[PDB]
Design a protein around this ligand. Structure first.
Ligand SMILES: Nc1ncnc2c1ncn2[C@@H]1O[C@H](COP(=O)(O)CP(=O)(O)OP(=O)(O)O)[C@@H](O)[C@H]1O
Ligand SMILES: Nc1ncnc2c1ncn2[C@@H]1O[C@H](COP(=O)(O)CP(=O)(O)OP(=O)(O)O)[C@@H](O)[C@H]1O
Ligand SMILES: [Mg+2]
Ligand SMILES: [Mg+2]
Ligand SMILES: [Mg+2]
Ligand SMILES: [Mg+2]
Length: 349
RNA sequence: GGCUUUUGACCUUUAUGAA
RNA sequence: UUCAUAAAGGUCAAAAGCC
Protein backbone atom coordinates (compact mmCIF):
# COMPACT_ATOMS: atom_id res chain seq x y z
CA UNK A 1 0.00 0.00 0.00
CA UNK A 2 0.93 3.69 -0.03
CA UNK A 3 3.49 5.01 2.46
CA UNK A 4 0.94 7.19 4.26
CA UNK A 5 -1.10 4.07 5.08
CA UNK A 6 1.91 2.01 6.13
CA UNK A 7 2.38 1.41 9.88
CA UNK A 8 5.78 1.87 11.55
CA UNK A 9 6.56 -1.85 11.78
CA UNK A 10 6.08 -2.27 8.02
CA UNK A 11 8.33 0.62 6.93
CA UNK A 12 11.31 -1.62 6.17
CA UNK A 13 9.06 -3.95 4.17
CA UNK A 14 7.83 -0.90 2.27
CA UNK A 15 11.44 0.14 1.55
CA UNK A 16 12.24 -3.38 0.35
CA UNK A 17 9.16 -3.80 -1.84
CA UNK A 18 9.22 -0.37 -3.48
CA UNK A 19 12.39 1.66 -2.88
CA UNK A 20 15.47 -0.58 -2.97
CA UNK A 21 16.86 -1.06 -6.50
CA UNK A 22 16.27 -4.38 -8.20
CA UNK A 23 18.91 -6.15 -10.29
CA UNK A 24 17.50 -5.14 -13.68
CA UNK A 25 17.04 -1.44 -12.93
CA UNK A 26 20.53 -0.85 -11.59
CA UNK A 27 22.20 -3.01 -14.27
CA UNK A 28 20.31 -1.23 -17.06
CA UNK A 29 21.28 2.18 -15.66
CA UNK A 30 24.92 1.09 -15.48
CA UNK A 31 24.76 -0.05 -19.10
CA UNK A 32 23.44 3.36 -20.12
CA UNK A 33 26.16 5.05 -18.06
CA UNK A 34 28.79 2.99 -19.88
CA UNK A 35 27.26 4.02 -23.21
CA UNK A 36 27.46 7.71 -22.29
CA UNK A 37 30.95 7.48 -20.76
CA UNK A 38 32.35 5.63 -23.78
CA UNK A 39 30.73 8.29 -25.95
CA UNK A 40 32.33 11.06 -23.86
CA UNK A 41 35.77 9.48 -23.94
CA UNK A 42 35.97 7.78 -27.32
CA UNK A 43 33.78 9.81 -29.67
CA UNK A 44 32.46 13.13 -28.43
CA UNK A 45 35.55 15.32 -28.35
CA UNK A 46 37.58 13.64 -31.11
CA UNK A 47 36.31 16.28 -33.55
CA UNK A 48 38.70 19.05 -32.49
CA UNK A 49 42.22 19.74 -33.79
CA UNK A 50 43.32 20.96 -30.35
CA UNK A 51 42.59 17.90 -28.17
CA UNK A 52 40.04 18.61 -25.45
CA UNK A 53 40.23 15.64 -23.14
CA UNK A 54 38.14 14.02 -20.42
CA UNK A 55 40.21 13.46 -17.27
CA UNK A 56 37.28 11.66 -15.63
CA UNK A 57 33.54 11.15 -15.75
CA UNK A 58 32.33 10.92 -12.16
CA UNK A 59 29.12 9.10 -11.34
CA UNK A 60 27.73 11.42 -8.67
CA UNK A 61 24.20 11.83 -7.35
CA UNK A 62 22.28 8.99 -5.73
CA UNK A 63 23.77 6.53 -8.23
CA UNK A 64 27.30 7.10 -6.95
CA UNK A 65 26.05 7.33 -3.38
CA UNK A 66 24.06 4.10 -3.51
CA UNK A 67 20.86 5.84 -2.41
CA UNK A 68 18.76 5.45 -5.56
CA UNK A 69 15.00 4.87 -5.72
CA UNK A 70 14.03 1.85 -7.84
CA UNK A 71 13.07 2.94 -11.34
CA UNK A 72 13.10 6.63 -10.46
CA UNK A 73 16.71 7.78 -9.99
CA UNK A 74 18.61 9.44 -12.82
CA UNK A 75 22.32 9.22 -13.62
CA UNK A 76 24.24 12.34 -12.60
CA UNK A 77 27.54 12.56 -14.46
CA UNK A 78 30.12 15.28 -13.95
CA UNK A 79 32.48 15.31 -16.93
CA UNK A 80 35.83 16.86 -16.07
CA UNK A 81 37.58 18.58 -19.00
CA UNK A 82 41.31 19.38 -19.22
CA UNK A 83 40.68 22.71 -20.94
CA UNK A 84 38.56 24.00 -18.06
CA UNK A 85 41.33 25.41 -15.88
CA UNK A 86 39.48 27.39 -13.23
CA UNK A 87 36.11 28.09 -11.61
CA UNK A 88 35.88 31.28 -13.66
CA UNK A 89 36.63 29.22 -16.77
CA UNK A 90 33.86 26.76 -15.86
CA UNK A 91 31.32 29.51 -15.21
CA UNK A 92 31.87 31.07 -18.65
CA UNK A 93 32.56 28.14 -20.99
CA UNK A 94 30.32 25.35 -19.65
CA UNK A 95 27.62 26.47 -22.09
CA UNK A 96 30.01 25.97 -24.99
CA UNK A 97 30.90 22.41 -24.00
CA UNK A 98 27.25 21.64 -23.22
CA UNK A 99 26.17 22.63 -26.74
CA UNK A 100 29.04 20.66 -28.26
CA UNK A 101 28.14 17.56 -26.26
CA UNK A 102 24.56 18.04 -27.45
CA UNK A 103 25.76 18.38 -31.05
CA UNK A 104 27.76 15.16 -30.92
CA UNK A 105 24.92 13.29 -29.20
CA UNK A 106 22.55 14.29 -31.99
CA UNK A 107 25.24 13.20 -34.45
CA UNK A 108 25.39 9.71 -32.93
CA UNK A 109 21.59 9.61 -32.92
CA UNK A 110 21.56 10.03 -36.71
CA UNK A 111 23.95 7.07 -36.92
CA UNK A 112 21.32 5.00 -35.08
CA UNK A 113 23.68 4.28 -32.19
CA UNK A 114 21.07 5.46 -29.70
CA UNK A 115 18.27 7.97 -29.15
CA UNK A 116 18.36 11.11 -27.02
CA UNK A 117 15.50 13.34 -25.90
CA UNK A 118 16.41 16.66 -24.32
CA UNK A 119 14.61 18.36 -21.46
CA UNK A 120 11.86 20.99 -21.38
CA UNK A 121 14.02 24.03 -20.53
CA UNK A 122 11.05 26.25 -19.68
CA UNK A 123 13.30 28.94 -18.25
CA UNK A 124 16.30 30.14 -20.26
CA UNK A 125 18.28 29.61 -17.06
CA UNK A 126 20.79 32.12 -18.43
CA UNK A 127 23.70 29.73 -18.25
CA UNK A 128 22.76 26.11 -17.61
CA UNK A 129 25.03 23.87 -15.54
CA UNK A 130 23.75 20.57 -16.92
CA UNK A 131 22.69 18.93 -20.16
CA UNK A 132 19.60 16.92 -19.27
CA UNK A 133 18.27 14.15 -21.50
CA UNK A 134 16.61 10.75 -21.72
CA UNK A 135 18.62 7.92 -23.29
CA UNK A 136 17.10 5.11 -25.38
CA UNK A 137 19.01 2.24 -26.99
CA UNK A 138 18.37 -1.10 -28.77
CA UNK A 139 20.58 -2.79 -26.16
CA UNK A 140 18.68 -1.16 -23.29
CA UNK A 141 15.40 -2.61 -22.02
CA UNK A 142 14.39 0.78 -20.61
CA UNK A 143 14.96 4.53 -20.80
CA UNK A 144 17.48 6.22 -18.50
CA UNK A 145 17.54 9.95 -17.67
CA UNK A 146 20.84 11.84 -17.46
CA UNK A 147 22.27 15.04 -16.03
CA UNK A 148 25.64 15.74 -17.64
CA UNK A 149 27.66 18.58 -16.16
CA UNK A 150 30.99 19.82 -17.58
CA UNK A 151 33.41 20.89 -14.86
CA UNK A 152 36.85 22.11 -13.84
CA UNK A 153 38.84 19.48 -11.91
CA UNK A 154 39.50 21.58 -8.79
CA UNK A 155 40.53 18.55 -6.72
CA UNK A 156 42.72 16.81 -9.28
CA UNK A 157 43.25 13.10 -8.74
CA UNK A 158 41.55 12.83 -5.38
CA UNK A 159 42.40 10.39 -2.61
CA UNK A 160 39.39 9.03 -0.70
CA UNK A 161 39.70 10.15 2.92
CA UNK A 162 41.99 13.08 2.13
CA UNK A 163 41.06 16.62 3.09
CA UNK A 164 41.36 18.92 0.05
CA UNK A 165 44.15 21.49 0.08
CA UNK A 166 42.41 24.47 1.75
CA UNK A 167 43.91 26.76 -0.92
CA UNK A 168 41.46 25.17 -3.35
CA UNK A 169 38.61 26.42 -1.18
CA UNK A 170 40.38 29.77 -0.83
CA UNK A 171 40.27 30.10 -4.62
CA UNK A 172 36.65 28.93 -4.69
CA UNK A 173 35.65 31.57 -2.15
CA UNK A 174 37.50 34.34 -3.99
CA UNK A 175 35.80 33.56 -7.30
CA UNK A 176 32.35 33.17 -5.74
CA UNK A 177 32.57 36.45 -3.82
CA UNK A 178 33.86 38.12 -6.98
CA UNK A 179 30.91 37.06 -9.14
CA UNK A 180 28.34 36.75 -6.35
CA UNK A 181 27.97 33.04 -7.09
CA UNK A 182 27.90 31.03 -3.85
CA UNK A 183 27.13 27.31 -4.21
CA UNK A 184 27.73 27.55 -7.96
CA UNK A 185 30.55 25.04 -8.34
CA UNK A 186 29.42 22.11 -6.19
CA UNK A 187 29.90 19.91 -9.27
CA UNK A 188 33.68 20.26 -8.92
CA UNK A 189 33.40 18.56 -5.53
CA UNK A 190 30.85 15.90 -6.44
CA UNK A 191 33.39 13.26 -5.38
CA UNK A 192 33.31 14.70 -1.86
CA UNK A 193 29.51 14.82 -1.94
CA UNK A 194 29.45 11.17 -2.98
CA UNK A 195 32.13 10.29 -0.41
CA UNK A 196 30.00 11.81 2.35
CA UNK A 197 27.35 9.11 1.81
CA UNK A 198 29.04 6.18 0.05
CA UNK A 199 30.29 4.18 3.05
CA UNK A 200 27.41 4.99 5.43
CA UNK A 201 25.60 2.07 7.12
CA UNK A 202 23.15 0.24 4.85
CA UNK A 203 20.13 1.10 6.99
CA UNK A 204 21.03 4.80 7.06
CA UNK A 205 20.84 4.72 3.26
CA UNK A 206 17.46 3.00 3.46
CA UNK A 207 16.18 5.73 5.76
CA UNK A 208 17.48 8.27 3.26
CA UNK A 209 15.51 6.45 0.55
CA UNK A 210 12.40 6.67 2.72
CA UNK A 211 12.81 10.41 3.32
CA UNK A 212 13.45 10.96 -0.38
CA UNK A 213 10.26 9.06 -1.20
CA UNK A 214 8.37 11.14 1.35
CA UNK A 215 9.83 14.30 -0.15
CA UNK A 216 8.77 13.28 -3.67
CA UNK A 217 5.26 12.55 -2.42
CA UNK A 218 5.11 16.05 -0.96
CA UNK A 219 6.24 17.29 -4.38
CA UNK A 220 2.87 16.12 -5.72
CA UNK A 221 1.09 18.73 -3.61
CA UNK A 222 3.55 21.62 -3.48
CA UNK A 223 5.18 21.24 -6.90
CA UNK A 224 8.65 22.79 -6.98
CA UNK A 225 8.16 25.14 -4.03
CA UNK A 226 9.99 22.85 -1.61
CA UNK A 227 13.57 23.05 -0.26
CA UNK A 228 16.27 21.13 -2.19
CA UNK A 229 15.99 17.33 -1.86
CA UNK A 230 19.70 17.30 -1.00
CA UNK A 231 18.84 19.31 2.14
CA UNK A 232 16.66 16.45 3.38
CA UNK A 233 19.38 13.91 2.59
CA UNK A 234 21.82 15.88 4.74
CA UNK A 235 19.23 16.42 7.47
CA UNK A 236 18.81 12.64 7.67
CA UNK A 237 22.57 12.11 8.05
CA UNK A 238 22.53 14.73 10.81
CA UNK A 239 19.61 13.03 12.58
CA UNK A 240 21.42 9.69 12.59
CA UNK A 241 24.78 11.15 13.63
CA UNK A 242 23.29 13.01 16.60
CA UNK A 243 20.61 10.46 17.49
CA UNK A 244 21.85 6.94 16.72
CA UNK A 245 25.29 6.33 15.17
CA UNK A 246 24.41 2.63 14.98
CA UNK A 247 24.05 0.20 12.08
CA UNK A 248 20.80 -1.10 13.52
CA UNK A 249 18.10 1.35 14.58
CA UNK A 250 14.36 1.82 14.24
CA UNK A 251 13.46 3.12 10.78
CA UNK A 252 10.26 4.60 12.20
CA UNK A 253 12.13 6.49 14.91
CA UNK A 254 14.57 7.87 12.35
CA UNK A 255 11.73 8.97 10.11
CA UNK A 256 9.89 10.69 12.96
CA UNK A 257 13.17 12.35 13.98
CA UNK A 258 13.57 13.87 10.50
CA UNK A 259 9.94 15.02 10.40
CA UNK A 260 10.46 16.77 13.75
CA UNK A 261 13.70 18.36 12.59
CA UNK A 262 11.80 19.81 9.62
CA UNK A 263 9.35 21.37 12.11
CA UNK A 264 12.29 23.03 13.85
CA UNK A 265 13.82 24.42 10.65
CA UNK A 266 13.91 27.90 12.23
CA UNK A 267 16.55 26.57 14.63
CA UNK A 268 18.57 24.39 12.27
CA UNK A 269 22.23 25.33 11.92
CA UNK A 270 23.99 22.27 10.54
CA UNK A 271 27.54 21.95 9.20
CA UNK A 272 30.43 19.49 8.96
CA UNK A 273 34.21 19.63 9.02
CA UNK A 274 34.65 16.57 6.82
CA UNK A 275 36.49 18.33 3.99
CA UNK A 276 37.24 21.80 5.40
CA UNK A 277 37.53 23.49 8.80
CA UNK A 278 38.25 26.76 10.62
CA UNK A 279 42.04 26.31 10.42
CA UNK A 280 42.41 28.40 7.28
CA UNK A 281 41.27 31.94 8.21
CA UNK A 282 39.69 32.57 4.80
CA UNK A 283 37.73 29.29 4.86
CA UNK A 284 36.80 29.79 8.50
CA UNK A 285 35.47 33.28 7.79
CA UNK A 286 33.36 31.95 4.92
CA UNK A 287 31.97 29.15 7.10
CA UNK A 288 31.27 31.63 9.90
CA UNK A 289 29.40 33.93 7.52
CA UNK A 290 27.24 31.06 6.26
CA UNK A 291 26.48 30.04 9.85
CA UNK A 292 25.20 33.59 10.49
CA UNK A 293 22.46 33.33 7.85
CA UNK A 294 18.70 33.15 8.51
CA UNK A 295 17.71 29.60 9.49
CA UNK A 296 17.74 26.90 8.36
CA UNK A 297 21.42 26.69 7.52
CA UNK A 298 22.47 23.32 6.13
CA UNK A 299 26.01 23.73 4.84
CA UNK A 300 27.17 21.41 2.04
CA UNK A 301 29.99 19.29 3.52
CA UNK A 302 31.71 19.48 0.12
CA UNK A 303 31.29 23.23 -0.43
CA UNK A 304 31.69 25.91 2.28
CA UNK A 305 29.84 28.43 0.07
CA UNK A 306 26.74 26.28 -0.40
CA UNK A 307 23.84 26.62 2.02
CA UNK A 308 21.72 23.65 0.94
CA UNK A 309 18.97 25.14 3.10
CA UNK A 310 18.16 27.26 0.05
CA UNK A 311 17.36 30.53 1.80
CA UNK A 312 13.64 30.29 1.02
CA UNK A 313 11.62 30.27 4.24
CA UNK A 314 8.33 29.73 2.37
CA UNK A 315 9.77 26.46 1.08
CA UNK A 316 10.41 25.23 4.61
CA UNK A 317 7.03 26.52 5.75
CA UNK A 318 5.33 24.28 3.17
CA UNK A 319 7.49 21.25 3.97
CA UNK A 320 6.80 21.66 7.70
CA UNK A 321 3.06 21.72 7.00
CA UNK A 322 3.52 18.32 5.38
CA UNK A 323 5.73 17.07 8.21
CA UNK A 324 2.98 18.05 10.66
CA UNK A 325 0.38 16.15 8.64
CA UNK A 326 2.52 13.02 8.29
CA UNK A 327 3.22 12.85 12.01
CA UNK A 328 -0.46 11.91 12.32
CA UNK A 329 -0.18 9.00 9.89
CA UNK A 330 0.49 5.32 10.78
CA UNK A 331 4.15 5.82 9.74
CA UNK A 332 5.51 6.82 13.13
CA UNK A 333 2.89 5.05 15.22
CA UNK A 334 3.08 1.88 17.29
CA UNK A 335 0.38 -0.78 17.19
CA UNK A 336 -1.39 0.94 20.10
CA UNK A 337 -1.50 4.23 18.21
CA UNK A 338 1.24 5.99 20.18
CA UNK A 339 4.13 7.73 18.40
CA UNK A 340 7.33 5.65 18.32
CA UNK A 341 9.24 8.72 19.52
CA UNK A 342 12.04 10.68 17.87
CA UNK A 343 15.72 10.24 18.70
CA UNK A 344 17.19 12.23 21.59
CA UNK A 345 19.50 14.66 19.78
CA UNK A 346 23.02 15.05 21.15
CA UNK A 347 24.21 18.66 21.07
CA UNK A 348 26.93 19.06 18.45
CA UNK A 349 29.60 21.69 19.13
C1' G B 1 19.13 -20.71 12.09
C1' G B 2 18.52 -21.17 6.25
C1' C B 3 17.96 -18.74 1.35
C1' U B 4 18.31 -14.34 -1.33
C1' U B 5 18.68 -9.25 -2.40
C1' U B 6 20.32 -4.44 -1.47
C1' U B 7 24.72 -1.48 0.42
C1' G B 8 29.53 -0.91 0.97
C1' A B 9 35.13 -2.54 2.49
C1' C B 10 39.52 -5.00 0.81
C1' C B 11 42.61 -7.71 -3.06
C1' U B 12 43.20 -8.92 -8.39
C1' U B 13 41.98 -8.61 -14.05
C1' U B 14 40.24 -6.49 -18.88
C1' A B 15 38.51 -2.42 -22.15
C1' U B 16 38.47 2.88 -22.42
C1' G B 17 40.00 8.05 -21.21
C1' A B 18 43.28 11.06 -18.42
C1' A B 19 47.48 12.69 -15.36
C1' U C 1 51.76 4.01 -11.43
C1' U C 2 47.49 6.92 -10.09
C1' C C 3 42.40 8.68 -10.97
C1' A C 4 37.80 7.80 -13.56
C1' U C 5 33.26 4.56 -16.13
C1' A C 6 31.71 -0.36 -17.28
C1' A C 7 32.60 -5.53 -17.05
C1' A C 8 35.13 -10.18 -14.75
C1' G C 9 37.06 -13.04 -10.41
C1' G C 10 37.89 -13.54 -5.09
C1' U C 11 37.28 -12.43 0.14
C1' C C 12 34.86 -9.56 4.25
C1' A C 13 30.97 -6.82 6.52
C1' A C 14 26.26 -4.21 7.20
C1' A C 15 21.05 -4.02 6.75
C1' A C 16 16.57 -5.90 4.78
C1' G C 17 12.90 -9.38 2.80
C1' C C 18 11.26 -14.21 2.72
C1' C C 19 11.19 -19.23 4.98
N1 LIG D 1 21.10 22.36 -3.84
C1 LIG D 1 22.20 21.59 -4.03
N2 LIG D 1 23.42 22.01 -3.60
C2 LIG D 1 24.52 21.26 -3.78
N3 LIG D 1 24.52 20.06 -4.40
C3 LIG D 1 23.38 19.53 -4.89
C4 LIG D 1 22.12 20.29 -4.73
N4 LIG D 1 21.16 19.55 -5.29
C5 LIG D 1 21.73 18.42 -5.77
N5 LIG D 1 23.06 18.41 -5.53
C6 LIG D 1 24.01 17.33 -5.90
O1 LIG D 1 23.64 16.74 -7.15
C7 LIG D 1 23.34 15.36 -6.95
C8 LIG D 1 22.25 14.89 -7.90
O2 LIG D 1 21.08 15.67 -7.72
P1 LIG D 1 19.65 15.06 -8.13
O3 LIG D 1 19.91 14.03 -9.20
O4 LIG D 1 18.75 16.23 -8.46
C9 LIG D 1 18.96 14.24 -6.67
P2 LIG D 1 19.88 12.76 -6.19
O5 LIG D 1 20.65 13.07 -4.93
O6 LIG D 1 20.68 12.16 -7.33
O7 LIG D 1 18.76 11.67 -5.82
P3 LIG D 1 17.70 11.13 -6.92
O8 LIG D 1 18.26 11.58 -8.25
O9 LIG D 1 17.72 9.63 -6.71
O10 LIG D 1 16.39 11.78 -6.58
C10 LIG D 1 22.96 15.24 -5.48
O11 LIG D 1 23.19 13.93 -4.96
C11 LIG D 1 23.90 16.23 -4.86
O12 LIG D 1 25.18 15.61 -4.68
N1 LIG E 1 27.36 18.71 -7.65
C1 LIG E 1 26.59 17.91 -8.43
N2 LIG E 1 26.88 16.59 -8.59
C2 LIG E 1 26.11 15.80 -9.36
N3 LIG E 1 25.00 16.22 -10.01
C3 LIG E 1 24.60 17.51 -9.93
C4 LIG E 1 25.39 18.44 -9.12
N4 LIG E 1 24.78 19.64 -9.20
C5 LIG E 1 23.70 19.49 -10.00
N5 LIG E 1 23.59 18.22 -10.45
C6 LIG E 1 22.50 17.71 -11.32
O1 LIG E 1 22.27 18.57 -12.44
C7 LIG E 1 20.93 19.07 -12.41
C8 LIG E 1 20.84 20.50 -12.93
O2 LIG E 1 21.79 21.32 -12.27
P1 LIG E 1 21.39 22.83 -11.89
O3 LIG E 1 21.16 23.57 -13.18
O4 LIG E 1 22.45 23.35 -10.94
C9 LIG E 1 19.83 22.69 -10.99
P2 LIG E 1 18.90 24.25 -11.00
O5 LIG E 1 18.77 24.72 -12.43
O6 LIG E 1 19.53 25.19 -9.99
O7 LIG E 1 17.41 23.91 -10.49
P3 LIG E 1 17.07 23.56 -8.96
O8 LIG E 1 16.43 24.83 -8.44
O9 LIG E 1 16.14 22.38 -9.06
O10 LIG E 1 18.40 23.25 -8.31
C10 LIG E 1 20.46 18.94 -10.97
O11 LIG E 1 19.05 18.75 -10.89
C11 LIG E 1 21.22 17.72 -10.49
O12 LIG E 1 20.46 16.53 -10.72
MG1 LIG F 1 20.11 11.98 -9.28
MG1 LIG G 1 20.02 14.78 -11.58
MG1 LIG H 1 27.90 -6.53 -4.69
MG1 LIG I 1 43.92 0.46 -17.93
Amino acid sequence: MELRHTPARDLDKFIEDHLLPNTCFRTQVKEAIDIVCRFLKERCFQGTADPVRVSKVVKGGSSGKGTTLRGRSDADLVVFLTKLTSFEDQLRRRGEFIQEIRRQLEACQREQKFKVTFEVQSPRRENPRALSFVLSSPQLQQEVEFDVLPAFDALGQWTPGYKPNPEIYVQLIKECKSRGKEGEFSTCFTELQRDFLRNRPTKLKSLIRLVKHWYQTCKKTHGNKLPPQYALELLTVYAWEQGSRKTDFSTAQGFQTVLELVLKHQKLCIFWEAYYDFTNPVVGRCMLQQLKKPRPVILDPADPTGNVGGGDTHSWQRLAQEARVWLGYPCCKNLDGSLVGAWTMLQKI
